[PDB]
Design a protein around this ligand. Structure first.
Ligand code: TPP
Ligand code: TPP
Ligand code: SF4
Ligand code: SF4
Ligand code: SF4
Ligand code: SF4
Ligand code: SF4
Ligand code: SF4
Ligand code: MG
Lengths: 374, 106, 273, 184, 374, 273, 184, 106
């Protein structure tokens, strides 16, 4: 278990390189530029290709093209840049092209406060594209998690063949300190690669799979010729407009994601035994919560639990419902006007307390203690 | 490639774009009326004997319907001024094959 | 390649589907013949094309075909080419494509000199979406969005690509497939960004409302508007209106490939330093 | 309701243009009519259909219902083989022998008529573009859902006059051929 | 009143012209090109300006620029094109620049079936931009509504100084028939124009308004000189990064819309007295529902109600909760995979029956009768 | 115009904010002097600028100022001018702006010839975002995304705009402010799309890693790079390496403005038909 | 926890770089350290600051708590005006009199010291770029949170070798001046 | 515009970019050390009586810090080779005022 001193963006780049990413493409924008800087020096190390395009649309298009032929690629942006990629993301969802998109959240709306921190890109990435879309999105909340979460995002993108968002934060991105990461052997052993059809003849069935598994795509220039497109495609990939196939394709796309729910989402639950209140929250805000709960032990007759989801989408509604039914007081802490509170309220079929702040500053966990007094 | 023929078309594909008959130096094709199909006019070869190695017709068919026999296994005729006169006369009739051509079903 | 066009095609999609006589099958035949002439094996060629009226070409050839979104074909092709910098990639797109909306992609690909084979199928209008106005549409014509005469001026794809920094610029047309195939043969073997401007015809959306409803009239109009490079160079500046030189226009020889330079960057970057 | 009509053909022909004329005539006459066009992404040579609903009260659904289409008119095999399943048993079907070859089961199921609309329009009148005017010229006597005067007026106020005269002639011609279709 | 015979798109263009729109700009795309085609001829009649750019970003940017100087302008798109405007919409939300965006839905996701009908742009337009956002979205559902709803959308956009969406549908747009519309005098008299500070002193305070009303923006080239930007601005418009002003800006942006709710959302309720099952639905789907209740009512042992919201966002939660509490049987009918189901279930804190169809085909109200049997 | 710079400036915002010696205050002074010399009234002048290191110029001039998003400044300016086709609007943007991300917008604005006053501040990098690689950075220099020497080629903004179809193309620098002011005075009075390529200096971010960390060294480097138009035209083709001709490069005097023709469309189209 | 430090200045001076060296020295010594930097959208001339948290145990919250910050080193009046209120009562403040002038309340409340860091770097050492090495030399001599030798080694293995020796010399000078600041 | 002053510098707007000194033909300007400011050096007018109407310096200052008098109200000096020699030997001294100029603080 090697330990190193670094910051969030360096750790994200190192995890991406060590997982096996060999392609990058994007546009420079504060504060998601350090990842590009690290990749531009770390990709020639291993023979990878780095290229800075003229905008973000090309930045994601080149990554999609590179990963369509069988190369592990990634892209990184922040705020407005992500707003320019939503056209291609849906394509990556429909053609089933793996991709990892890092998003260092900053102060929305449009440009506003480019040097501040906010969590306003949650409901945006819940359903960013037009039409139907099932979203998978992680949420690092510590320096030690900027590595393992990136590894998990790459593994999920390879296993499900769907784009995966990494909701990195400015506070996590720019904090500098000492971290512990798993050894190289463990990381290389747990790596997951996409499936290949070694069989004879030709693939001929890239999308001819069951109702709960993704597509099998072979690398280009290898003998198996198939046609990929963003239209509703049949077993081979040619566009179609039949009612049965069109309605079955989207159902399969949803079911392949909503069936692996036992392994897709994790969550950290602490002090959930005998707790009177819960301080359910996600992301870098948890870094404040874990501090405040360390000081509220001084005289509190009541015990406060904490339930932090690790994968924002799809939400853990099954556990949320039981948590809401079991406990009486629920507290939600966020860094926006309550856009993830809507999902928590839809679950539990209940109304819960909220504590938001969207001025571009942190929480300062003294405020958490002041709110716990009620 | 049928034996004994130089240029032949496929009636199941040809649409009647008036392009193949507009490039023949000898004018051996003509668009005859065929009411069985949608467009109504289909290309019919009229003078296969006067076919020249100018593959232009197959080069000007965006539909994959007309084919011309190769030089090795077939012999093509020579260029005569009568062929050019016939081509220009057929062209000057809105690419429709002239009536007298049907004197022998050509 | 020859009378046997079915070896390089998918039998399940023929016949074509464009209108009845659109000048798009000729381009396909020329591409097939040229790709066979060089001796290229079809297991190495990737054909990427965007959405529109010319994207259907991606659904007929029997190879690794990619159908991209609007105007992003060049970026996907660049990603594919740098992913595997040893295989041949051909891009096919229309006027409403990367020379209308994705202009930045084409200009920057020309600037950085990546080994692509961009082919523009020019029909002067938006064929699929019922005859809108294009940047290459001549002024004073009738379009559904300009019912009194187009006022926007004309882009010059050859001049713009030359200004951007393309390494091989050539123009041809469907009026003569032999010279088009020869130009494609000369340009495919190059080792830089090759631009092929091809003049096509759209008689269903352009000629219907501009007294050119027949394919023959549009073809003869395009023939009249097109002259050879030497003949065009032999004219007076006033006479050079609505004229376009034909053939290979620029074939500069001493340029450095982007991949050939990134190879040196890789070698001298962290190859033991 | 009164009329459920389905006109099918190949894109780029012109027969389907005579759809909205009947709906407009019925609307002017005092009733209500709704037209819905199903077109394919193929610009030319593709199957195209038009569904027309005519009634005396407000039309809520612009779309028809399967098994309830009273009248069908087809001038192409591609659309005929596709959109023939919505015709009510013993309905009215019109085709042309030069472009459509029906099956014996459809003959037993329907009261199909054979009128070569395209040949009549192109050969007799002289201009083929008027085929649509010919086609609806039969429909007036096919479903008998509107008088001829209103249809003639709507035709007059929907076409440029430079050919309208000869256009009127085409209409009359169609009527006569309609009177030649009822051999029974 | 006056009666005409027309279609949905020409009615929308006519209503836009009558309300006083004088600038249009966009990139044509099926099936929303009909509105552009109508406007391109309608606008030069009254001296307006119609311009077509190369893409959608410029198409909405020119409209924003024209309406920034004090001109009424609108833009139209469909599906993927809307996905290319979300970068600018947020700008229009932050600088308080009025705009009306028409969206003719088709079969999402990316191109897929570009000649079908779907309702997948509801959850997308609930929150399309990054950061925080308060969406206003109308929903025409009849031939007679494509005029009045367009006029209401223009009036709301001018009154609130915020982008307003018009959720037109392919079925409504392409339908043809006889419509009755209000007369010229009343339509012109109901028009609402944006307020301008005439005064005697100069403006000196374009963004210095109360905490529950929009900002006042005088036209350019008239003496008042102020600065407009997308950053967090102060009373005049100069960017600032103060916490208090930054929080107050977004608080006022939300409150200026959430406090006028009584005038924003209208909904049509019919047969709600004594009904057993409600068939709550929206948009063109209602065109089937209203027919089905006419046939089910011929023979039945129960009465069936109907509650169609004419304004999707912001949601009428106050009435939805009462409707859910009053009755026992609920049924939501949509043309997607349940995107507006989430808000209905979040309200009333309850679970309801669902009926959806996402194969590009209509509902065929025989299916409504079959499903009502349960 | 003179010692009285405070009439056209927001004196509260003064002093400027750039670095200590960035060559952007000189361009602001030249713009102010040119505006006053033509007799323009500040109530009829709108200044719209994109976001970047050169966008701060829109926060100092005392007029109607607009600060748009990245690369969209030209579109907002086009909308503003079309709304009020009788006033003067000036666009200020950098090289990372509409020649990098908004290339399509600039090319189409040149094509349709909208009455704008585009001014491009050229510092050869992305100054605001700490020295990235611009589409105008010469090869061999050290940037943050190319730490082994830039390999991407260079653009030619004047040549690119001329090929696009701009009506007035000129180039100057901050080395001789008098020539810059004279060329700005000549270009503003024109009635078409005027393009000014102004070579500025960024010693803090570009020259720091290239042994030009002082303002004087970078200024003399650009002085060596820049030659007059006549001298450049008199040089040998091998002598024109990394040489840019200054002065007005194109001043075509026969072009129909877009609004001037849309007015005719309005008059003859629906002017009582 | 053990230490909360704040280094403030003008963007482009390089004094702030002396911070993370202390964090890494504490990390190597056997503790935990965290650094958080506050900057502006201004490349040069703007106010910049860095906060440093040093503790013997795990650090959870990265940011510093207002009203508790222990040590502050400022070489600019613009920054010192804004980032001064967070200092706890009776804290340690180091300034250079040529660029910073404190009010009477600050002198009554804090334990301010006046050392001309930039003048020492330019005139005493010879190279102004090494000013950070001077500033760090003061901090270790006033807070004594990290042992000297660890700091010297960490600084030495973090700078280019071509100047290494003189860098060490700079450190020495700083210590001397700190020992001259203890006249109280 | 004070009386009898050909050129004066505003010390609160100068930064020390060295551009103003580098374009003075007459060698009138020079940079002096000022430890009270961030950059440490400020521009100073040394020999105002040798000033020339070459307003170039004011044309090259980016921070609005140096001003020149007006021709209509002030009489400017003439051209001498001593001034150009001084300008050259000032540019040779890193754009700073030479030690001899400290003869009277000019
Ligand atoms: C996703 C999508 N984008 C665009 C269109 C419509 N469309 C088809 S072609 C075109 C303009 C580009 O066509 P172009 O390449 O210029 O020429 P074409 O060959 O189609 O005539 C547009 C907007 C569509 N139906 N769907
Ligand atoms: C809201 C926002 N969007 C995008 C960016 C990214 N960005 C803004 S300016 C800039 C650099 C562009 O430099 P350029 O315009 O070429 O000239 P410069 O400003 O460096 O002088 C970048 C990457 C940002 N900082 N903020
Ligand atoms: S060119 Fe081909 S498709 Fe056209 S008429 Fe001739 S044979 Fe038929
Ligand atoms: S091959 Fe030549 S001669 Fe024969 S039909 Fe074709 S054009 Fe005529
Ligand atoms: S619409 Fe035009 S470009 Fe498209 S297939 Fe038809 S003729 Fe060809
Ligand atoms: S970073 Fe460069 S361009 Fe920006 S203000 Fe500083 S010197 Fe000027
Ligand atoms: S006006 Fe001329 S002589 Fe006087 S200080 Fe300025 S540059 Fe020197
Ligand atoms: S040019 Fe101006 S800012 Fe620069 S040193 Fe001279 S007086 Fe100061
Ligand atoms: Mg086209």
């Amino acid at each position: 278990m090697r330990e190193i001193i670094s910051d969030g963006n360096e750790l994200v780049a190192k995890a991406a390189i060590e997982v096996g990413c060999r392609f990058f493409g994007g546009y420079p924008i504060t504060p998601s530029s350090d990842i590009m800087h690290a990749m531009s020096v770390a990709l020639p190390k291993c023979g990878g290709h780095f290229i800075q395009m003229e905008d973000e649309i090309s930045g994601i298009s080149v990554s999609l093209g590179a990963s369509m032929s069988g190369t592990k690629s990634m892209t990184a942006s922040s705020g407005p840049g992500i707003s320019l990629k939503v056209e291609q993301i849906g394509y990556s969802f429909m053609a089933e092209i793996p991709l990892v998109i890092a998003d260092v959240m900053r102060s929305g709306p449009s440009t506003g406060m480019p040097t501040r921190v906010a969590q306003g890109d949650v409901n945006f990435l819940k359903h960013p594209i037009h039409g139907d879309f099932k979203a998978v999105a992680l949420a690092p909340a510590s320096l030690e998690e900027a590595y393992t979460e990136t590894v998990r995002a790459f593994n999920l993108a390879e296993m499900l063949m769907t784009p995966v968002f990494l909701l990195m934060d400015e506070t996590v991105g720019h904090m500098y300190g000492k971290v512990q990461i798993p050894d190289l052997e463990e990381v290389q052993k747990m790596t997951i690669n996409r499936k290949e059809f070694v069989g004879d003849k030709k693939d001929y069935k890239p999308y001819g799979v069951a109702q709960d598994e993704p597509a099998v795509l072979n690398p280009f220039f290898k003998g198996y010729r198939y046609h990929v497109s963003g239209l509703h495609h049949g077993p081979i990939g040619f566009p179609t407009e039949d009612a049965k196939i069109g309605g079955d394709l989207i159902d399969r796309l949803f079911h392949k994601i909503e069936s692996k729910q036992d392994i897709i989402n994790e969550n950290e639950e602490m002090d959930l035994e005998g707790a009177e209140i819960v301080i359910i929250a996600y992301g870098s805000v948890s870094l404040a919560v874990k501090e405040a709960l360390k000081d509220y032990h001084k005289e509190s007759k009541q015990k406060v639990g904490f339930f932090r989801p690790k994968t924002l989408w799809p939400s853990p509604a099954k556990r949320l419902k039981e948590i809401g039914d079991k406990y009486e007081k629920i507290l939600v802490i966020e860094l926006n006007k309550g856009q993830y509170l809507e999902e928590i309220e839809r679950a539990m079929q209940r109304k819960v307390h909220f504590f938001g702040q969207a001025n571009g500053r942190t929480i300062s966990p003294k405020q958490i203690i002041a709110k716990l007094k009620e | 490639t049928p034996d004994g023929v130089a240029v032949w078309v496929n009636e199941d594909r040809c649409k009647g774009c008036d392009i193949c008959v507009s490039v023949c130096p000898a004018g051996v094709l003509g668009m005859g009326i065929e009411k069985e199909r949608v467009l109504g006019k289909v290309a019919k070869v009229a003078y296969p004997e006067s076919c020249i190695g100018c593959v232009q017709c197959e080069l000007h068919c965006p539909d994959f319907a007309i084919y011309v026999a190769d030089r090795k296994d077939f012999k093509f005729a020579k260029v005569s001024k009568e062929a050019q006169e016939r081509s220009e006369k057929v062209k000057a009739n809105k690419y429709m094959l002239l009536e007298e051509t049907i004197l022998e079903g050509r | 390649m020859a009378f046997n066009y079915d070896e390089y095609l998918r039998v399940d999609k023929i016949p074509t589907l464009w209108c009845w006589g659109c000048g798009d099958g000729v381009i396909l035949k020329s591409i097939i013949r040229t790709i066979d002439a060089l001796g290229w094996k079809m297991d190495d060629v990737c054909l990427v094309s965007g959405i529109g009226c010319s994207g259907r070409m991606s659904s007929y050839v029997n190879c690794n075909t990619v159908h991209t979104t609007h105007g992003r074909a060049v970026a996907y092709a660049t990603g594919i080419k740098m992913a595997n910098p040893s295989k041949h990639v051909i891009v096919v797109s229309g006027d409403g494509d990367g020379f209308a909306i994705g202009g930045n992609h084409t200009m920057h690909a020309c600037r950085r000199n990546i080994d692509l084979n961009f082919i523009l199928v020019n029909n002067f209008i938006y064929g699929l979406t019922n005859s809108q106005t294009s940047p290459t549409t001549p002024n004073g014509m009738w379009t559904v969005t300009a019912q009194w005469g187009n006022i926007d001026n004309q882009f010059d794809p050859c001049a713009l690509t030359t200004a951007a920094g393309a390494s091989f610029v050539a123009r041809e047309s469907v009026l003569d497939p032999q010279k088009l195939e020869k130009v494609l043969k000369e340009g495919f073997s190059h080792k830089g960004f090759s631009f092929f401007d091809v003049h096509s015809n759209c008689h269903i959306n352009l000629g219907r409302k501009n007294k050119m409803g027949e394919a023959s009239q549009m073809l003869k109009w395009m023939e009249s508007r097109l002259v050879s490079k030497r003949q065009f160079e032999a004219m007076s500046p006033e006479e050079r209106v609505d004229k376009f030189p034909t053939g290979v226009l620029r074939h500069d020889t001493d340029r450095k490939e982007y991949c050939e330079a990134y190879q040196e960057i890789i070698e001298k970057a962290q190859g033991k330093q | 309701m009164e009329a459920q009509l389905r006109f099918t053909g190949v894109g780029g022909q012109g027969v389907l243009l005579a759809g909205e004329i009947l709906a407009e005539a019925k609307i002017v006459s005092g009733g209500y009519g709704t037209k819905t066009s199903t077109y394919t992404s193929q610009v030319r040579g593709g199957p195209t259909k038009v569904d027309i609903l005519l009634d005396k009260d407000e039309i809520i659904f612009p779309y028809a219902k399967e098994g309830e289409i009273d009248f069908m008119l087809s001038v192409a095999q591609i659309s005929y083989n596709q959109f023939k399943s919505d015709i009510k048993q013993g309905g009215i079907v019109v085709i042309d022998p030069n472009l459509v070859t029906p099956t014996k089961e459809d003959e037993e199921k329907y009261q199909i008529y054979k009128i070569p609309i395209i040949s009549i329009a192109k050969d007799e009148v002289g201009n083929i573009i008027t085929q649509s005017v010919v086609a609806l010229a039969i429909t007036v006597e096919l479903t008998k859902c509107v008088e001829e005067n209103i249809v003639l007026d709507t035709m007059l106020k929907k076409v440029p006059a430079k050919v309208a005269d000869t256009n009127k002639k085409a209409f009359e011609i169609g009527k006569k051929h309609a009177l030649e279709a009822l051999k029974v």
